[PDB]
Amino acid sequence: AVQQRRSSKHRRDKRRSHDALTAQALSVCQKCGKKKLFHRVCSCGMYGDLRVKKAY
Amino acid sequence: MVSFMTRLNVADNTGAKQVGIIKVLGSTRKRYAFLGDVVVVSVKDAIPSGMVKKGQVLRAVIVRTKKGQQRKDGTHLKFDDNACVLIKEDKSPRGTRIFGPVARELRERGYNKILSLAVEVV
Amino acid sequence: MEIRGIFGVKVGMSQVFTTNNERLPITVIYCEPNQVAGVKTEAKDKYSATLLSFDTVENKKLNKPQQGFFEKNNLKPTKHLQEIRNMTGFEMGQQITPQNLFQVGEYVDVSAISKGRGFTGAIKRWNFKIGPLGHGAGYPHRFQGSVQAGRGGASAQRVFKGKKMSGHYGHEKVTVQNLRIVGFDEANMLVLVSGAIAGPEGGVVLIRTAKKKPGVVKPIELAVQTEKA
Amino acid sequence: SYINKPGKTSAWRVMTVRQQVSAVLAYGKIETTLKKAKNTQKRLDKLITLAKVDNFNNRRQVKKWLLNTNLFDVDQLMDHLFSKVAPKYEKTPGGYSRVLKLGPRRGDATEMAILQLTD
Amino acid sequence: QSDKLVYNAVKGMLPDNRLSRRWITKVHVFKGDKHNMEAQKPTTLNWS
Amino acid sequence: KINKQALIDLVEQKQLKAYVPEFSAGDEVNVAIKLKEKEKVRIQNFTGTVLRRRGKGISETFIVRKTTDGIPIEKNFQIHNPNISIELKRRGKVRRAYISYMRERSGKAAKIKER
RNA sequence: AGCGAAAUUCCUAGUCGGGUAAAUUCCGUCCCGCUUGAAUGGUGUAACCAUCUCUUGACUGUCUCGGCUAUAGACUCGGUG
RNA sequence: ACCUCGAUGUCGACUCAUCUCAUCCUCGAGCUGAAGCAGGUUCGAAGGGUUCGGCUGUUCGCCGAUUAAAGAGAUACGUGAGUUGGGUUCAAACCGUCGUGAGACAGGUUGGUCCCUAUCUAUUGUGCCCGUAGGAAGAUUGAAGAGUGUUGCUUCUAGUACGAGAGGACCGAAGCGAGGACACCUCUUAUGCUCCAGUUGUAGCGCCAGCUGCACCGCUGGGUAGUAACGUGUCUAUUAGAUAAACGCUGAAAGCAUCUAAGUGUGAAACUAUCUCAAAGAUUAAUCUUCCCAUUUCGCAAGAAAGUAAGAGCCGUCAAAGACGAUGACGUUGAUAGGUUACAGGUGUAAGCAUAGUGAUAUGUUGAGCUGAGUAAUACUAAUUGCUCGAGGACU
Lengths: 56, 122, 229, 119, 48, 115
Known about the structure:
The structure is cut from a larger assembly and holds chains A (56 residues), B (122 residues), C (229 residues), D (119 residues), E (48 residues) and F (115 residues). Chain B is 4% helix and 28% strand. Chain B is built from one helix and seven strands. Chain C is mostly beta strands. In chain C, the strands form three sheets. A six-stranded antiparallel beta barrel of chain C has the order 1-2-10-9-6-11. Chain C has a three-stranded antiparallel beta sheet with strand order 3-4-5, with no helix packed on it. In chain C, strands 7-8 form a two-stranded antiparallel sheet. Chain E is 38% helix and 0% strand. Chain E is globular, with a radius of gyration of 12 Å. In chain E, 0% of the residues are buried. Chains in contact: A-D, B-C, B-F, C-F. Chain C binds chain F through residues 11-12, 14-17, 21, 23, 28, 30, 32, 56, 187-188, 190, 222-229, and chain F through 1, 3, 5, 7-8, 10-11, 13-19, 58-59, 78, 80-83. Strand 6 (75-79) of chain B pairs antiparallel with strand 4 of chain F. Chain C binds two RNA strands through strand 1, strand 2, helix 1, strand 5 and strand 6. Chain C: One of its GO terms (molecular function) is rRNA binding.
């Protein structure tokens, strides 16, 4: 169904301002640069186990 | 489990052939049937080879249900045959011999000569 | 009445043949012995309660404030502690066993978690009725249930507060009373209790005195003939 | 539900698992979604445990979950794996392969994971 | 409980504002005799 | 605390018979049942075969189907119940456990047994 | 003449019988026939009607008495929207 | 005719019921041309329930079957943004009738379509911010509450009293109960869709055998865990305060007396204490507790820099949990999930070898084949040495 009026800016912001983003995990690399997410492979290959991957 | 409206035979020499369950006596919402219980029935087929005629509403006793039930003593009695009996408000029905098995639940309510007369007592 | 009891956890459930060789639904429960942390007596803490400690763990995985309080009370290291209000007090630090707490035939109450059903409808969370779907089904037959005490300008035109609606069901501890004590065992803090236990898997049960009566003990045990032939 | 993407039932699930295990055995490593990667790794561990013991019965049992791929025919796959991969991991109890988290793909922007083996 | 009865009476004799409920908060009436503001030297009066 | 969950054997030992002749789905067996009515000690004899046998130690139950003068009656007993006197009669060729086609067949069509 | 409460009849829940445990179903018997009527046919007729019912067999998740799973979304993620 | 004729879904059935008593039973009591049984009359009082099959466009209306009873009134004549459309009142047509006739009967019938992706008040659960006032967290209290407070049968006591005679009581206890709230899949049933055995056709794999896809997850039989019932397991309370009907004892008014005007017990399924738990943002922000450090000092006591250790969040192994959040543990200080291993269970002698059978087939092989989730030890894999904020008691 629908009402007989419109929804102003304030109602939307009360809906939108609580849709705001949040923070994330982080992982400083202990052997290289290219700071990466936690529990994620750094973007320069050399990972803890080994260079499980590449830089690109 | 054993809901009503299930035509079944008899267990003694009464002349009747078929009979159906109609209603639960006293408190409603029972919705099911158990062995050795008195329930009001509506006869479905009764040829004049005995005394029962079609169109009679009385309380018959069912003793066999193919679905079976769990007796709380630790005996899961499940039958494979269906029959009932009609008692004249005492320990003896109209038939001379009692055919078919009979449960022992109907013991503290009396009716032991029927057990001694029926083919099987379980 | 006098309040005593112990904790417990579900370690299984099966059938047990008690006296008269009849089957009884018996649940085996590992009771957790409680080491008393003291008594919060009234006129001293205003709510009488026997402080029980539980979940015995090691030291290196302990929290500094909880560890400091535990050492200040000098109570032996257990991970968690809780009070039981109006429970008969005991000395700080002792052996609590259901064999000495109660008799083998008393009446007790239990408190066990339930299953998490996730989001669940009324018919499975409040057990309402579902009508026939024959002679045409079409639209959803089970969404919320139709109520009309409000219609027009002023009859109610709104729903009363507390109308059971959308939400999660289960995953909540339920307290049941008047359950018999069945069997005494102390090999591995095991007990036997009649009935069906609340909890889908690995439920935790709080057991205290039943509040309909202190629990009249009656002689019931197990009967069996372990024979070789 | 009428005409649409028809089905993603467990039949397609196990079919995709078979395709992915065939691929990873054909290339020693595969990069896919972690959710599918873990189910693939379970099936891979079961296959490896089956391939530890070798016999015509064991070969028949192994030949129920593999298909022909490029750069490695099904017979070539079986030959290569039973020659080197199975004896190599026959000393480590459990935890055969290693699964590691990758970045998001460009298409769906969904998480990928790399499964590595043949040490 | 009888102090809450006086609370209800005075709240029914006050003009309905935020100041009214704050005045309600500014009243410490209890059935007992042991309280805390008696240490602040409360000037005894009656019907003010 | 970690529990081995082997307490099932511990609760069995307080309800176990020491001989307990076992059976599989497809073996005929007669069961003697002593009943203490205090006036007529009926040794109930239930003959037939076990249709399904539940295991897992203490939950061991089994349904036996008797045909008393053409009256088929299938009754589910339990292994650990007291007063149970199972006497093994003969053992047959166990084709498939949980025999469901034996709950619908009758005499003159039974399976072979071993003396 | 015929048929006559029916799709037609107001007195109706038409009399009565059958069946139905139980008939505001139906079919037969008398004939509440303002408005019974003979080619806007009076009676019925073999076969048939995606014709209208009435009863049963067999049968079932329609009820008793609802539960599991799968797809499809609803939930999240990314793109339009 | 006051607006809703610049749209009022306004029946029945189903679900949910709720509200009131003029409660019907049910509770108790008084009166009674009321021996008992069995009644009637009057009174207060709602805790639960107040049945079912059938026909009917129908709850109606009626028939029949049950209890101590089968209630009444209400919600645009409860419930079409909840459902159907069962139909007077469509269009199509018929029956009988009427109208000269288009058509109609305040008559019946054949057949027939009643939408909505929720903006908000309302409603229910879950989440982030901070208050909460030194922070953080455990135990809690409890201000206000909710759920629930239902009912019968039989026997012993008793064929006892009762009239005399048939007949035959309330209640003390007991069991039997119904019905529902609740528990789980413990045994029975159901389920089990990556679980297997039997199992045909095509397609392939040089071929038999054997494997796989599809052919209803080709199908039938089952079953691990979970999840339900058709399964059995707790309860149907007691107590107290004031109690209604309803008697009181004393006693005046009004020199006897009299529940009442003073004082004084009783007594209803009614109300609340009492049972089940939620329940301080309960701004009435409630209590205790421990840890944190007080590591200087321009400025408004530790940000002008040292900025918790109390923790808290992110991430992951995960799982009672599970839309996300949150939920609980674990995170290299290492057993938190998966396994590795052995076991339960079945799937019930796998393949294959050997023997006899032309062949099907008959025996050791061998409980063999394996196990989604079942039982337990398990660095073997994954859980990063990872990121962020985070104190000086802020003021009496």
